[PDB]
Design a protein around this motif. Sequence first.
Motif, PDB file in Angstrom:
ATOM      1  N   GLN C  88       0.829  -1.200   0.000  1.00 35.07           N
ATOM      2  CA  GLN C  88       0.000   0.000   0.000  1.00 35.07           C
ATOM      3  C   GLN C  88       0.869   1.257   0.000  1.00 35.07           C
ATOM      4  OE1 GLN C  88      -3.123  -0.095   2.925  1.00 35.07           O
ATOM      5  NE2 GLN C  88      -3.922  -2.060   2.191  1.00 35.07           N
ATOM      6  N   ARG C  89       0.362   2.345  -0.585  1.00 35.42           N
ATOM      7  CA  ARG C  89       1.114   3.592  -0.696  1.00 35.42           C
ATOM      8  C   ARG C  89       1.065   4.384   0.609  1.00 35.42           C
ATOM      9  NH1 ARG C  89       2.300   5.395  -5.896  1.00 35.42           N
ATOM     10  NH2 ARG C  89       2.299   7.534  -5.045  1.00 35.42           N
ATOM     11  N   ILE C  90       1.861   3.949   1.581  1.00 32.91           N
ATOM     12  CA  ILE C  90       1.816   4.504   2.938  1.00 32.91           C
ATOM     13  C   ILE C  90       2.891   5.563   3.203  1.00 32.91           C
ATOM     14  CG2 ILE C  90       1.972   3.958   5.373  1.00 32.91           C
ATOM     15  CD1 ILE C  90       0.980   1.206   4.759  1.00 32.91           C
ATOM     16  N   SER C  91       2.471   6.799   3.459  1.00 31.69           N
ATOM     17  CA  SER C  91       3.430   7.879   3.690  1.00 31.69           C
ATOM     18  C   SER C  91       2.993   8.785   4.839  1.00 31.69           C
ATOM     19  CB  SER C  91       3.649   8.696   2.403  1.00 31.69           C
ATOM     20  OG  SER C  91       2.459   9.324   1.947  1.00 31.69           O
ATOM     21  N   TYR C  92       3.962   9.425   5.482  1.00 33.94           N
ATOM     22  CA  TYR C  92       3.701  10.294   6.630  1.00 33.94           C
ATOM     23  C   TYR C  92       4.584  11.522   6.570  1.00 33.94           C
ATOM     24  CZ  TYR C  92       1.367   6.309   9.085  1.00 33.94           C
ATOM     25  OH  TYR C  92       0.551   5.271   9.458  1.00 33.94           O
ATOM     26  N   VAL C  93       4.132  12.591   7.213  1.00 25.57           N
ATOM     27  CA  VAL C  93       4.916  13.790   7.395  1.00 25.57           C
ATOM     28  C   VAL C  93       5.364  13.834   8.852  1.00 25.57           C
ATOM     29  CG1 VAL C  93       4.912  16.341   7.398  1.00 25.57           C
ATOM     30  CG2 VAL C  93       3.709  15.088   5.586  1.00 25.57           C
ATOM     31  N   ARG C  94       6.654  14.066   9.062  1.00 24.31           N
ATOM     32  CA  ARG C  94       7.201  14.220  10.402  1.00 24.31           C
ATOM     33  C   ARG C  94       7.035  15.677  10.848  1.00 24.31           C
ATOM     34  NH1 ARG C  94       8.006  11.152  14.865  1.00 24.31           N
ATOM     35  NH2 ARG C  94       9.547  12.128  16.270  1.00 24.31           N
ATOM     36  N   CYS C  95       6.294  15.890  11.930  1.00 22.26           N
ATOM     37  CA  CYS C  95       6.011  17.245  12.398  1.00 22.26           C
ATOM     38  C   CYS C  95       5.812  17.252  13.907  1.00 22.26           C
ATOM     39  CB  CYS C  95       4.768  17.810  11.688  1.00 22.26           C
ATOM     40  SG  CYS C  95       4.283  19.499  12.186  1.00 22.26           S
ATOM     41  N   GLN C  96       6.600  18.064  14.603  1.00 20.67           N
ATOM     42  CA  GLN C  96       6.452  18.252  16.044  1.00 20.67           C
ATOM     43  C   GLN C  96       6.303  16.941  16.811  1.00 20.67           C
ATOM     44  OE1 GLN C  96       3.360  21.257  16.503  1.00 20.67           O
ATOM     45  NE2 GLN C  96       4.427  22.626  15.074  1.00 20.67           N
ATOM     46  N   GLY C  97       7.235  16.027  16.567  1.00 25.61           N
ATOM     47  CA  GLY C  97       7.334  14.801  17.343  1.00 25.61           C
ATOM     48  C   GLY C  97       6.343  13.740  16.911  1.00 25.61           C
ATOM     49  N   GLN C  98       5.651  13.971  15.801  1.00 24.31           N
ATOM     50  CA  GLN C  98       4.610  13.040  15.372  1.00 24.31           C
ATOM     51  C   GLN C  98       4.736  12.600  13.929  1.00 24.31           C
ATOM     52  OE1 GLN C  98       1.415  12.574  17.596  1.00 24.31           O
ATOM     53  NE2 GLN C  98       0.870  14.743  17.789  1.00 24.31           N
ATOM     54  N   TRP C  99       4.273  11.381  13.657  1.00 22.96           N
ATOM     55  CA  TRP C  99       4.097  10.908  12.286  1.00 22.96           C
ATOM     56  C   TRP C  99       2.679  11.245  11.835  1.00 22.96           C
ATOM     57  CZ3 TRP C  99       8.528  10.093  10.149  1.00 22.96           C
ATOM     58  CH2 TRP C  99       9.585   9.557  10.884  1.00 22.96           C
ATOM     59  N   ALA C 188     -13.579  19.536   4.385  1.00 20.29           N
ATOM     60  CA  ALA C 188     -12.934  18.262   4.663  1.00 20.29           C
ATOM     61  C   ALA C 188     -11.957  18.428   5.823  1.00 20.29           C
ATOM     62  CB  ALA C 188     -12.223  17.741   3.443  1.00 20.29           C
ATOM     63  N   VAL C 189     -11.198  19.515   5.790  1.00 17.53           N
ATOM     64  CA  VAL C 189     -10.203  19.758   6.821  1.00 17.53           C
ATOM     65  C   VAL C 189     -10.821  20.034   8.211  1.00 17.53           C
ATOM     66  CG1 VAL C 189      -8.402  21.363   7.537  1.00 17.53           C
ATOM     67  CG2 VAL C 189      -8.404  20.434   5.203  1.00 17.53           C
ATOM     68  N   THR C 190     -11.877  20.855   8.295  1.00 21.73           N
ATOM     69  CA  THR C 190     -12.509  21.140   9.592  1.00 21.73           C
ATOM     70  C   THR C 190     -13.267  19.923  10.110  1.00 21.73           C
ATOM     71  OG1 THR C 190     -14.543  22.095   8.600  1.00 21.73           O
ATOM     72  CG2 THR C 190     -12.786  23.637   9.150  1.00 21.73           C
ATOM     73  N   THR C 191     -13.806  19.126   9.201  1.00 23.40           N
ATOM     74  CA  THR C 191     -14.582  17.956   9.586  1.00 23.40           C
ATOM     75  C   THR C 191     -13.701  16.950  10.304  1.00 23.40           C
ATOM     76  OG1 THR C 191     -16.191  18.238   7.844  1.00 23.40           O
ATOM     77  CG2 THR C 191     -15.922  15.993   8.717  1.00 23.40           C
ATOM     78  N   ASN C 192     -12.519  16.707   9.765  1.00 18.39           N
ATOM     79  CA  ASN C 192     -11.598  15.805  10.437  1.00 18.39           C
ATOM     80  C   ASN C 192     -11.044  16.380  11.746  1.00 18.39           C
ATOM     81  OD1 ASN C 192     -12.083  14.046   8.375  1.00 18.39           O
ATOM     82  ND2 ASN C 192      -9.930  13.843   7.750  1.00 18.39           N
ATOM     83  N   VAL C 193     -10.903  17.700  11.819  1.00 22.33           N
ATOM     84  CA  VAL C 193     -10.476  18.310  13.069  1.00 22.33           C
ATOM     85  C   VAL C 193     -11.571  18.153  14.134  1.00 22.33           C
ATOM     86  CG1 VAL C 193     -10.204  20.550  14.197  1.00 22.33           C
ATOM     87  CG2 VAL C 193      -8.722  19.912  12.261  1.00 22.33           C
ATOM     88  N   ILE C 194     -12.804  18.503  13.778  1.00 29.46           N
ATOM     89  CA  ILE C 194     -13.948  18.395  14.687  1.00 29.46           C
ATOM     90  C   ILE C 194     -14.161  16.978  15.225  1.00 29.46           C
ATOM     91  CG2 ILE C 194     -16.489  18.521  14.842  1.00 29.46           C
ATOM     92  CD1 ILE C 194     -16.369  20.893  12.905  1.00 29.46           C
ATOM     93  N   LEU C 195     -13.990  15.978  14.365  1.00 32.55           N
ATOM     94  CA  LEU C 195     -14.280  14.591  14.725  1.00 32.55           C
ATOM     95  C   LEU C 195     -13.098  13.885  15.383  1.00 32.55           C
ATOM     96  CD1 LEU C 195     -16.082  13.231  11.514  1.00 32.55           C
ATOM     97  CD2 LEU C 195     -17.206  13.757  13.693  1.00 32.55           C
ATOM     98  N   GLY C 196     -11.942  14.544  15.416  1.00 35.56           N
ATOM     99  CA  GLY C 196     -10.729  13.920  15.914  1.00 35.56           C
ATOM    100  C   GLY C 196     -10.283  12.779  15.010  1.00 35.56           C
ATOM    101  N   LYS C 197     -10.441  12.968  13.709  1.00 31.36           N
ATOM    102  CA  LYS C 197     -10.189  11.916  12.734  1.00 31.36           C
ATOM    103  C   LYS C 197      -8.814  12.076  12.060  1.00 31.36           C
ATOM    104  CE  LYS C 197     -12.873   9.639   8.997  1.00 31.36           C
ATOM    105  NZ  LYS C 197     -12.164   9.901   7.710  1.00 31.36           N
ATOM    106  N   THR C 198      -8.127  10.951  11.873  1.00 29.56           N
ATOM    107  CA  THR C 198      -7.013  10.876  10.934  1.00 29.56           C
ATOM    108  C   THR C 198      -7.373   9.910   9.808  1.00 29.56           C
ATOM    109  OG1 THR C 198      -5.853   9.073  12.110  1.00 29.56           O
ATOM    110  CG2 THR C 198      -5.242  11.350  12.714  1.00 29.56           C
ATOM    111  N   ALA C 199      -6.843  10.159   8.616  1.00 26.79           N
ATOM    112  CA  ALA C 199      -7.022   9.230   7.503  1.00 26.79           C
ATOM    113  C   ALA C 199      -5.962   9.466   6.430  1.00 26.79           C
ATOM    114  CB  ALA C 199      -8.438   9.354   6.907  1.00 26.79           C
ATOM    115  N   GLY C 200      -5.208   8.412   6.118  1.00 23.43           N
ATOM    116  CA  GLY C 200      -4.234   8.461   5.042  1.00 23.43           C
ATOM    117  C   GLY C 200      -4.897   8.196   3.700  1.00 23.43           C
ATOM    118  N   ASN C 201      -4.282   8.674   2.618  1.00 29.63           N
ATOM    119  CA  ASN C 201      -4.801   8.470   1.263  1.00 29.63           C
ATOM    120  C   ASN C 201      -4.352   7.136   0.649  1.00 29.63           C
ATOM    121  OD1 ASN C 201      -2.085   9.158   0.950  1.00 29.63           O
ATOM    122  ND2 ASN C 201      -2.424  10.294  -0.954  1.00 29.63           N
ATOM    123  N   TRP C 202      -4.484   6.063   1.414  1.00 29.13           N
ATOM    124  CA  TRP C 202      -4.115   4.742   0.929  1.00 29.13           C
ATOM    125  C   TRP C 202      -5.114   3.727   1.473  1.00 29.13           C
ATOM    126  CZ3 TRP C 202      -0.921   7.475   4.360  1.00 29.13           C
ATOM    127  CH2 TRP C 202      -0.884   6.986   5.666  1.00 29.13           C
TER     128      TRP C 202
END
Lengths: 505, 505, 505, 505
Positions: C88-99, C188-202
């Motif tokens: 699967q096309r799995i990628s992350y951004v490293r930011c402030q101690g987090q993947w 899309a961006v506020t919805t994931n913030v409000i719901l406490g959601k993460t989701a990768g594009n894979w």
Amino acid sequence: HPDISVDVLVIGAGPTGLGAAKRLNQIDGPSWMIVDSNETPGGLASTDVTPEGFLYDVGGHVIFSHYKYFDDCLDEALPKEDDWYTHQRISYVRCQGQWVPYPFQNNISMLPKEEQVKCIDGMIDAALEARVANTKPKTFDEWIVRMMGTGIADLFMRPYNFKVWAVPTTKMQCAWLGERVAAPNLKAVTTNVILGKTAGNWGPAATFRFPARGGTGGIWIAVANTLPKEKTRFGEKGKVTKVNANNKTVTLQDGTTIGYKKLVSTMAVDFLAEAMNDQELVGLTKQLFYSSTHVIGVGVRGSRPERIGDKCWLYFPEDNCPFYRATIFSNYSPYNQPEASAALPTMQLADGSRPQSTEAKEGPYWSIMLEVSESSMKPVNQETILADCIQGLVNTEMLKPTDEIVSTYHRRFDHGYPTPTLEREGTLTQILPKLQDKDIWSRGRFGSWRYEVGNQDHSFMLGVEAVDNIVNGAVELTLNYPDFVNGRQNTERRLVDGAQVFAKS
Amino acid sequence: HPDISVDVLVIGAGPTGLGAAKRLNQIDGPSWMIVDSNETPGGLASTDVTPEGFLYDVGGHVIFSHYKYFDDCLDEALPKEDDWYTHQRISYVRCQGQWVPYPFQNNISMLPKEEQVKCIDGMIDAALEARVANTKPKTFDEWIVRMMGTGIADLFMRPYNFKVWAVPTTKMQCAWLGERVAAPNLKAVTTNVILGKTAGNWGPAATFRFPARGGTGGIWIAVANTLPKEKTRFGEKGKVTKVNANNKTVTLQDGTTIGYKKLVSTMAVDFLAEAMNDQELVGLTKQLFYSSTHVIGVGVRGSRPERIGDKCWLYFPEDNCPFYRATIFSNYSPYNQPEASAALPTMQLADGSRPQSTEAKEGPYWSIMLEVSESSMKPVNQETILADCIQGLVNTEMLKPTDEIVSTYHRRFDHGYPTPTLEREGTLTQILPKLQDKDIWSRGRFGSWRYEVGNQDHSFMLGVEAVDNIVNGAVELTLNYPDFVNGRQNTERRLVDGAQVFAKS
Amino acid sequence: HPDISVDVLVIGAGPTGLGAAKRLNQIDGPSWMIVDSNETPGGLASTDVTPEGFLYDVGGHVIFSHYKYFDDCLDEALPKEDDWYTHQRISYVRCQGQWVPYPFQNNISMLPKEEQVKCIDGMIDAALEARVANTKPKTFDEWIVRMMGTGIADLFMRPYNFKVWAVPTTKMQCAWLGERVAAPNLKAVTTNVILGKTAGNWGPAATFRFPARGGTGGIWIAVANTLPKEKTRFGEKGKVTKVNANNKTVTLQDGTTIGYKKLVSTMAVDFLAEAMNDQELVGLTKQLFYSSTHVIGVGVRGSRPERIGDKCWLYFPEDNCPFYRATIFSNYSPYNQPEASAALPTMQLADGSRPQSTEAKEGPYWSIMLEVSESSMKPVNQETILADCIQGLVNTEMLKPTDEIVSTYHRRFDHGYPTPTLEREGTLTQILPKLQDKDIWSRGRFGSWRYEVGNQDHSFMLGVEAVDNIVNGAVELTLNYPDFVNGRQNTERRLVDGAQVFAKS
Amino acid sequence: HPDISVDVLVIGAGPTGLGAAKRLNQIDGPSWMIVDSNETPGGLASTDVTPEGFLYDVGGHVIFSHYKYFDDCLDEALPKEDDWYTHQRISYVRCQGQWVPYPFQNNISMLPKEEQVKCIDGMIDAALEARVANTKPKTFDEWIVRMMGTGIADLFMRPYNFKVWAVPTTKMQCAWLGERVAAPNLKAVTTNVILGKTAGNWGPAATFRFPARGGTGGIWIAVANTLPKEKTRFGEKGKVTKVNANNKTVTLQDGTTIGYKKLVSTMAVDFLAEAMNDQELVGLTKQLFYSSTHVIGVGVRGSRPERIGDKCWLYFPEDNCPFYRATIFSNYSPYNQPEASAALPTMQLADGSRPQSTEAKEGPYWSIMLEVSESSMKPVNQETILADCIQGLVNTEMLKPTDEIVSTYHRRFDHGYPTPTLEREGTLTQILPKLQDKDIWSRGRFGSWRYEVGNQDHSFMLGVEAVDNIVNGAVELTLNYPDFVNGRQNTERRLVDGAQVFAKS
């Protein structure tokens, strides 16, 4: 020749008439007189008391003054520090099992997340539309949805305002809400949702003062008491029954006739037309719209429950209670209800049950004041509304099924709210100029029928400014420019102006 | 103890001071007194006459009244129908060899077509930007371009206003212009271009009245005459040299001391600060900006030329004349210049040459009045300004080279226009409150320095309202809310109010 | 006469050149040969191996294929199921101690609440601006901030892309990003913030396949193996030193001359200009801009750490490491590194210390591949970059201080990325048509210098379509219309077309 | 076993089928054959002649080529300079007694001023809406109004297009019109109005070429002649009656059966479905909408009238004539009608009168070709349409009542226009893939039913590209991306490609 002649006659001794009288008494130029059909002045700013000793205003009455003149007269009437109690302006909206701090939109973090998403999506739509908007909203409903977006509108301001006005928000104008652009503060709303934060619009600076004794009604009794008694006529002796505008003569209940040069009328303008026997004006004033107000009072045994706390007034958009607003009237003054050592039997439990014992027991007591609206579009069963209100207190968790009720109060007020319908101004600009042509200044909450200047201080000043126009050629600013007087602190006019200063010297 | 004591002292008998005096006199309560350094009341609303008998106001003075009170006082002063002449409000813009009817943008069909394209293109840009505008313009220049587009802005309002204000449009605020949205009426402008139509903003309903005799100065002489003479002190005997604000004592040039309770000062507020020897106010009032006005008058032999016709006042954006406005002063009244039978020699021809004959000859005569502005940013050669104006008249085709000039006039008025700079308000809200805390009401064109309420009616009412605030607690609406008073007919305050009627009984 | 004559000569046997060769071979009409200075085909899509047995690509190479033709050739080259591994096309951004899962803006619920407010606030501004936008962004930077808003742009895409491109985002164009409107999906961006959601594009549908053996380089070795050997000349024997465009002759290192009718050149176009001894072209190609790539490889003892898991490639906007991208190369194939039983001594710990013990211990092993850019605007200290990379792995928590490193790799590739500068297109339109008019088809990642069509499938197809244009009059769609080929599935052209089917009968 | 077998069968020898044939002949790979029910190739691009010697195309046919390949074949077919005549693209719109140059909006200076105002106001509205638009138009009608504004839309494009398509503009899609934003060029329109200018979209650069002889049909006879005669079958012998897709066999009217491997079909796809006896396809193709075309030709005695001049084609939005378009066919070639010495009697005058004499008289002659549309929403009375057209010529001042008509022509063509209805694409994306799954390339004006690629050059290339896909794997760009092919010069594909050059060496 009439039994009495005066330069200026004032009909009514609610806040508007008392304003006219206070200014006339200060000016001390033209001769004048004030009448009222009630021995007690105050009008809809009066206060009743139940046989058990619970006081009730005519619904929630909280003073916010736009005028130093108003302040001067209240200070003169009740000059001592413990004539008053100071409170923060604490209010909440009842929604989906929660007490949501006002303003509603800054506090929707208390609602389920899925609902938050719908609210924010709706307000995003509104923010984007507002960015390209080039028309003004035309109805109350349009104003609401452009400020809040659909989701937030539907949760509070739309259903709440129907319960208040007893007409749909699509049938009301929105000019009365003032000059502010109808657009959301999207950042403030999403910021509180993100932070999971709540915040009311009150604090150490956001306060009101309430009278220690007599309820709101205490103010106006005290104000009235500063007038020379012999220029007043209150009670059945002061009841106006006929107004002959062509002869500038009023006829009272007992047959007394009063000649005037100028008339300040503060009774409801539809009543004034009838009293004038003027068919044209009758027809026109029948086209004004208004709602009636049922006031329900409930006296409860026990110390103030934690869940109620420092709450002052409360909004009810939902359909599980008939009232649109509740006031924790016992929080306004400790003298709005009996002292803890006074003994009262329990009348019923809140779920409707009989008490275990009919014996008089001691307090302390707290107190809830409720408002229910009525109109031709929204009937009110007068024989069940009390019990429905109490059931509504249980549904909203203000009262537990076991809470002991020791006093009940219900009264219907025919003219409660003058409605800002779409047709109002069209109708008013036919009525008020015809009265003006006959040297009649019809002023006040139902005297001139504008809710946006319909509070105690507006009303009082409508009377004051009506006299100032009659005598000194002042602009009637509160009457014709609500946004002007509501947008500033009006400081120029005082209970002692230069005229009285220079005269005394 | 001072030589004289009054409740209210008024300094200055221009329209503002006379307004204060008129209202004090009507109210007839507080004692009062008005002083002026000039034997003739009127201030900048006065009139000079040349030795040849040609009258000149201090530049074009055309009355548009916003107030019934002002009308009452002009009517009382000059009550006869033949005390006035009525005219239509006819004005044009001189542009590229043509007289273009005001408003300029509605009449650009007169310009070459290629130039019309450039104008319309610019106004199309402004229309499209206005459609998505969400900020208010911050400068006069920005306001002008938003309203007109670049092309039209560059033809008239930009260069014209530099010639008027003697500062760049980029250096002035635009709030003074009102609350209207800064945006073009693209449809009206293109419609007149498409129809090849011209139209002025005048007609039988858009008129002004001008005094038959004495020029504008005649109004204020006659208004002053209705005052009790003993309460006036005009001339050297009335020149104020010193104000002691702490003692509430004024000293006049002849040594006379006047004590006061309240002061209405209508002299320029920079002069007031100097007289107060108040170094802080001096420093503050030097931060205000103003321009001087040069008034030039030219008396011409001949009956009124066809090319001039019924023109009243005229605007000059272009570089070929130093003046910004011309007035056909002989159209305003037949008695603004000598009768035809009066014999006067020719002083010069309009091209500067000596006349063939030096003999006195008859008229009739007509007359042109010009205004040239000056400031630190726009110096003016005073020695050549008269000859330059006259050549300007030849350049703009107002005068033929052979026209015979029989009278000339030039006078400089140091305080001519109070400038709406970006800094004006920030400065004034330090000055005016500081003066008012000392019970000094500083009001008028340079009393309070606000051009947008800077005309004769405005000035008169600033005086009236100042007194009304001092005595009756009235709001000073003209002072603090220009948009309000300018946007309505002010009818409530009259020369006879209820007070005077009820007292007379 | 030259030593060799062919119809179509191909220079370079990376993916572009091999594409040309495969299509020439399939068509089997005009004569052809292909040359490369390297004995092993594959170019920047080749693979190195360390003496310890760790493979490294030229930085992270993940195939996404836009074309069936490319698919047919890979299937042919490597036909067995166990020639490939699928991930699967799995990628992350490293930011402030987090993947943080990619795409970043849909996953900012992982950042602190105060970061979320700043992000959403910035995106609200961009949303409101996009609502009235009527101009395309002109720079990469403008595109980013219009897409993301300031706060989100500043956290990831702005600093990340400087670290990638080695030039400021303000110096790059943005057409290369395609035709999508530069605007946020605020909902899309506020919805994931409000719901406490993460989701990768894979997920199960977003996969790639990687060669089981030989790294990416294994593909092009095997593709090249399907060509007839006598038509290839790989190694020192195939190194081009001279191109005489006027004679249509190419000279090799060993003196061999090759006459051609059409030339498909896939070497860097700046090198081609040199080989051509064409000072005008050398001058033009020097206006193009490119960055060098440092590939750093790190072999680690241990079974794959939980914190690493199934991660494939990783983005690093922050300045606590020199590299812009990391790849877990050991996740791509178990044969990218040695088997568990292979014995290797520890070279160094991740903290930089070197142990005394030379003991060879067993595995298993895992492997990290890193990329650092260099350009004339961004120097790289070759002597320390390995150590800095390793410290970077510790700062980003990819390696523990105590992790044991058993292999290191570092190589600098001069032409790494062709930069889409503001000037690129202007320069290419002076270069590519000029080469075209000499019957030179210069194509490929540095053959035609366009990153948006600069992957392995793009490169292969630029070769294929170049031949198709030369022979069949095909449109070169990948070269002139990157948005066209990237926005569809290109299925029409196959390794067996009708021409070959009909011919077979 | 079929009577004949080929690799590729081509049905139809209109421009599309001839395209496929020319490409197959060039490639000279797979065996092929082309059939037509008509002995003369050309289809709707053919030409008729009246017994008086007046030629008529199937309505106005003007070539604009987007492809070099198309030009190659036309050049090959008619290589001589005097095989062709060249003309500028001169067209006008008939409106309110005026010949208004195309494009309409740039020439409304010819309309009355009051109408120019309504027009410009409408476009000002459209421009202001365009500035804030965030949706694409969804109908042809919405597209027109957004481009033109209401007033300009109502005068031309709305009524004209109903007369063309025989359906309302609200029922058609607008994607077929291309990718340009639907918005007005307000400045271009107001500029020409202000300047009083008319200007057409033609000049020395904007030309077309027309065959010297045989009309448009001459082109296709000549192209067909370049094919090997024995691979053709034109006439009754060539009429397809059955298509058995499962067996890949076509049957002809004379019983001949032809086996194929691939089928390129250019007959109307609704007829194709019938021939396949496939009921699902019959149902689907019945859901396509199309209009019929009536062509009316009128031959007139006399040299070309001045009022006609160099006009080529003309649009008729108005209701005083049944035709939507006229062509001055005599302007295209002097051989489109008899020479001056040819003698003809007068059949009638233009107002329907009998001529004074029936003697044959000489010319010269000129000629008008008219088009009238028919559908189920717009019937055409076939018995009166000629006379109605002729009356229409008088009403539009194309003919004087006295003009002598020497030849008339009428013919109905069942499949005239393929209609871009809202439903078109939903239907076609069901039909074409099913035909594709059977190795059937259905292509052409009614083969693939898409008007935006429905011209001669589009059609020819639809056939060329279909073969290129069948043999070489080419993308069918003209079929699937009309905007792509119409927006560029397609220069890559030539009648002689590299393949043919390399084979001949």
